[PDB]
From Swiss-Prot:
The lineage of its organism: Bacteria, Bacillati, Bacillota, Bacilli, Bacillales. GO terms for molecular function: flavin adenine dinucleotide binding; sarcosine oxidase activity. NCBIfam families: PRK11259.1, soxA_mon. The keyword Electron transport does not apply. Binds 1 FAD per subunit. Pfam families: DAO. It is found in: Cytoplasm. This is Monomeric sarcosine oxidase. Keywords: Cytoplasm, FAD, Flavoprotein, Oxidoreductase. Belongs to the MSOX/MTOX family. MSOX subfamily.
């Protein structure tokens, strides 16, 4: 008996950003979440996320990253919660052997991004505590950095609610009923209707998009991070130790300097367990690889950051087959917007994605170029159910 203008299902990284954008414009919005964001059951916890701009994954990503960066600076000004610290982001790998490094370097050139290029011992000299072989090269982006991701969602929620958005917590959406002129969601706490729907359920998109007659390969992965006791004279943000994402022969790792003595945090990017979001084991350390894959990197490349484990977390990626996002209207329903498959690299864009989703919901179009995120693209291996 309350009709909304827009309902957002899944008020996490993408949905809460969309909620803020909609509320800002006086759009009557309901956000429904299975938990109470920010929380520790989805893809947004573990405190910190890298934002970088030299995005070799595709041209379309660079302006989205730069717009998102400006939106994060705006958010910083709007809230009391801490949003962004400009740690810089270091990318390294073996010379001539890392597509990730090469693509990052190409992206910086193509978009005239401000970066430093260094190699071998220059890396170890600039950032004491890093020990790479002489045949490694690097590209450092001084103006990118680290987002406090739980703070971001909390701030967007507070601002959205202040403007009149309603947030229904601890409420799982179980089904959808879509009409030419309205949308309906079904939950154990009641059913709700609106003119438009945004669907942004994170790892649960892989289970519930079938309720919208969609059959899209989406695989959730269990991805752990650990915080380690570190040499603070080397690895502290206070001594300019950078965020990093790097490629070594056995994969990609990412991490964060120690903030206020929390310890250096590390994740292994290219490996995780295939899981179901409803049965995933969210306890860190239950597989020996959780800790050992991290320490194998640290002892080789960041040896003074390989101390006692201070904290672990268990988070999820949701991968598409091509590892590009899905941001598009539902092919059968122009009043339904889908945001899915962020493939372990979506958080930095979540501010810009909130803007895109807002535009798609209200106008059926966006000013951003999102062509590479089309739900109809062949590399998805997608169709209707
Ligand atoms: C360990 C780790 C490190 C990462 N590091 C980075 C990084 O450094 N840089 C970067 O850009 N990205 C990073 N990412 C990726 C980024 O965090 C994700 O791409 C992004 O958070 C996905 O956002 P989302 O809104 O799709 O999912 P979420 O933020 O998980 O939001 C989905 C929401 O949907 C809700 N929901 C689920 N089912 C229902 C239902 N049936 N009804 C109602 N609500 C429902 C959930 O409760 C949740 O709140 C990392 C991810 C992980 C796991
Ligand atoms: Cl993801």
């Amino acid at each position: 008996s309350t009709h909304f203008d827009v309902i957002v299902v899944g008020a996490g990284s993408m949905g809460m950003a969309a909620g803020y954008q909609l509320a800002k414009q006086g759009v009557k919005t309901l956000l429904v979440d299975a938990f109470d964001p920010p929380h520790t059951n989805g893809s947004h916890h573990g405190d910190t996320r890298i934002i970088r701009h030299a995005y070799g994954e595709g041209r379309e990503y660079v302006p989205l990253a730069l717009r998102s960066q400006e939106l994060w600076y705006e958010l910083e000004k709007e809230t009391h919660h801490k949003i962004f610290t400009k740690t810089g982001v270091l990318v390294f790998g073996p010379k001539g052997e890392s597509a990730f490094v090469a693509e990052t370097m190409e992206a910086a050139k193509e978009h005239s991004l401000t970066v430093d290029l260094l190699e071998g011992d220059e890396i170890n000299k600039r950032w004491p505590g890093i020990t790479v072989p002489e045949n490694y090269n690097a590209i450092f982006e001084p103006n990118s950095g680290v987002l406090f991701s739980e703070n971001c969602i909390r701030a967007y929620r507070e601002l959205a609610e202040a403007r009149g958005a309603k947030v229904l917590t601890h409420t799982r959406v179980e089904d959808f009923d879509i009409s030419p002129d309205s949308v309906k969601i079904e939950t154990a706490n009641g059913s709700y209707t609106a003119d438009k729907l945004i669907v942004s359920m994170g790892a649960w998109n892989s289970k519930l998009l079938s309720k919208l007659n969609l059959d899209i390969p989406l695989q959730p992965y269990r991805q752990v991070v650990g915080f380690f006791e570190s040499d603070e004279s080397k690895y502290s943000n206070d001594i300019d130790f950078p965020g990093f994402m790097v490629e070594v022969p056995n994969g990609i790792y990412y991490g964060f300097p120690s903030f206020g003595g929390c310890g250096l945090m590390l994740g292994y990017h290219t490996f995780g367990q295939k899981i179901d979001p409803d049965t995933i084991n969210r306890e860190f350390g239950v597989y020996p690889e959780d800790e050992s894959n991290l320490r194998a990197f640290l002892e080789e490349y960041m040896p003074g950051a390989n101390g006692e484990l201070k904290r672990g977390a268990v988070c999820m990626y949701t991968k598409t087959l091509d590892e590009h996002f899905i941001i598009d209207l539902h092919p059968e329903h122009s009043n339904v917007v889908i945001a899915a498959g962020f493939s372990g690299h979506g958080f930095k864009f979540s501010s810009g994605v909130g803007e895109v989703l807002s535009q798609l919901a209200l106008t059926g179009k966006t000013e951003h170029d999102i062509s590479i995120f089309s739900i109809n693209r062949p590399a998805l291996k997608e169709s209707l159910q």
